Amino acid sequence: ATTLKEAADGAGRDFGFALDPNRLSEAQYKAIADSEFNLVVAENAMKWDATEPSQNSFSFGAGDRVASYAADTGKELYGHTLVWHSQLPDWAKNLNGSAFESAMVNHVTKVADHFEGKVASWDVVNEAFADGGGRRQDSAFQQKLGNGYIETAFRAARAADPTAKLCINDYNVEGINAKSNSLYDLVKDFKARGVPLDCVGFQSHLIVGQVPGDFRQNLQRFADLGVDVRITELDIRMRTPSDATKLATQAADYKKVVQACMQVTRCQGVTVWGITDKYSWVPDVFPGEGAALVWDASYAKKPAYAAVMEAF
Numbered sequence: 001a002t003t004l005k006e007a008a009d010g011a012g013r014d015f016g017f018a019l020d021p022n023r024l025s026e027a028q029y030k031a032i033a034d035s036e037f038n039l040v041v042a043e044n045a046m047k048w049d050a051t052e053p054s055q056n057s058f059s060f061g062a063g064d065r066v067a068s069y070a071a072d073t074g075k076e077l078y079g080h081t082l083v084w085h086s087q088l089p090d091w092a093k094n095l096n097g098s099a100f101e102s103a104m105v106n107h108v109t110k111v112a113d114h115f116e117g118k119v120a121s122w123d124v125v126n127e128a129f130a131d132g133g134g135r136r137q138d139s140a141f142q143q144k145l146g147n148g149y150i151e152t153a154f155r156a157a158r159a160a161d162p163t164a165k166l167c168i169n170d171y172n173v174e175g176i177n178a179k180s181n182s183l184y185d186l187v188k189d190f191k192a193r194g195v196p197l198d199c200v201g202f203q204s205h206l207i208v209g210q211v212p213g214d215f216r217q218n219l220q221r222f223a224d225l226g227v228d229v230r231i232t233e234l235d236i237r238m239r240t241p242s243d244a245t246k247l248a249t250q251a252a253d254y255k256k257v258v259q260a261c262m263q264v265t266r267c268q269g270v271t272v273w274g275i276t277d278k279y280s281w282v283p284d285v286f287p288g289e290g291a292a293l294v295w296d297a298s299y300a301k302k303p304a305y306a307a308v309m310e311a312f
């Protein structure tokens with residue numbers, strides 16, 4: 001193969017990226033987006049704040065732009081995200097009880113219906129668990145609705161879109177630990193009771209040199225529950241500036257993550273969280289850290305590019 005798209009294509013897998021529609025007007029950005037991936041997900045265009053900026057007033061512009069890009073270039077489209085505690089507009093945060101529940105059911109219904117037949121899989125609920133185990137406590141959904149909100153989301157999404165794969169997504173659930181254990185219990189429960197849930201996504205926002213040694217083992221145990229698994233927001237950050245050793249380790253880290261996926265038959269593929277280091281969300285959250293993506297800020301391929309090629 002000569003592009004990652006070709007390598008993932010031959011492996012029978014997905015290799016995607018987080019798209020900011022506003023960047024498509026930068027030729028180098030578009031050139032890479034067109035050539036190297038076979039799947040696309042909206043970085044921000046499909047979240048709650050960008051789609052229902054005010055109660056019952058949907059804004060599908062940015063979202064449609066991403067959905068059009070995928071259809072026009074023949075890429076699979078992944079949806080992100082229906083229910084999520086962050087980027088929740090204040091009108092929602094001010095809602096209470098059944099009212100809040102109705103706003104949630106309606107948001108899930110409208111957004112899923114609008115993209116029906118275009119989005120192949122959705123992160124219906126994202127980041128429901130707390131590091132350390134148990135439910136996230138700082139979530140308006142958990143507070144206002146209690147434990148059953150997740151099941152309600154999945155049931156409402158399945159009713160609006162009969163065929164989209166419905167996934168639950170989280171971070172720090174890559175290795176076997178208290179967070180992935182709680183995640184595992186919930187999936188087992190859902191499958192036992194017939195709650196519609198088809199896949200589990202593992203964000204994989206990792207640190208260089210710190211890739212969980214039991215990644216494969218963990219993906220496999222979820223797969224055994226009869227669900228598909230996917231790596232959804234992969235980037236492996238470092239303390240900047242980067243150097244020859246930091247880039248070499250990161251390469252090897254990319255290789256390990258992709259091989260974990262290649263080794264679990266139900267691992268659908270891998271989605272990196274962006275294309276180039278220059279637009280990466282990392283420096284804005286973790287000051288002092290960065291250089292986490294496969295292309296540097298000059299659009300030059302970092303050693304990671306060749307590692308991923310090999311893993312596929």
Ligand SMILES: *[C@H]1O[C@H](CO)[C@@H](O[C@@H]2O[C@H](CO)[C@@H](O)[C@H](O)[C@H]2O)[C@H](O)[C@H]1F
Pocket residue numbers: 043044047081086087126203233281
């Ligand atoms: C996976 O993690 C990424 C990184 O935070 C999330 O995407 C970021 O979300 C924030 C908040 O909406 C945006 O400001 C960033 O531009 C975006 O990269 C993603 O939603 C998540 F679930």
